[PDB]
Amino acid sequence: LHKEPATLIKAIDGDTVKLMYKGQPMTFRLLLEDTPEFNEKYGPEASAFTKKMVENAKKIEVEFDKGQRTDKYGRGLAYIYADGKMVNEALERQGLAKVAYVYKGNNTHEQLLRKAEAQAKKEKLNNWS
């Protein structure tokens, strides 16, 4: 896979962020993730985590997988990086997301993200507490 540039427009919630990509505003949905909704337990914490990570980044990148690039709602489907650190993985490692929505052909980083999840769950962090 390949990283491509984007710039932050606005934080949305744990697993969605508004970015400018190829000069156009898009909502991106994190591949292979499910954060709690804001109104659910750990939702505000997941939102705050993603918000801080993308707002503090000097360089945002998106990385599409091999399959679908946009979902049925018109959201981009990507792994998002903030100064080289994957947001999806960072959420997993802090117990603020679950690996989910694993569709065949669009699942390159599945096992990386599951490994982060296992280590969060061993530590009983956040969702796993």
Ligand X SMILES: Cc1cn([C@H]2C[C@H](OP(=O)(O)O)[C@@H](COP(=O)(O)O)O2)c(=O)[nH]c1=O
* Binding-site sequence positions for Ca(2+): 15, 34-35
Supply 109's token pair. 């980083």
Per DSSP, the three-state class of 29 is: strand
Q: Is 31 in the site for ligand X (CB under 6 A)?
A: yes
Closest CA to 41 of 111, 98, 80, 83: 98
Supply 120's token pair. 């969060």
Q: Which region among 29-37, 46-54, 56-64, 115-123 touches ligand X (by CB under 6 A)?
A: 29-37
Q: Which region among 1-9, 26-34, 83-91, 107-115 touches ligand X (by CB under 6 A)?
A: 26-34
**76 vs 95, beta carbon nearer ligand X:** 76
**Cβ-closest position to ligand X:** 101
Output phi, psi for 26, to 5 deg: -140, 145
- Cα–Cα dist 129/125, whole Å: 5
Active site residue 37: yes
Residues from 35 through 64 that contact Ca ion (CB under 5 A): 35
Give the active site residues: 29, 37, 75
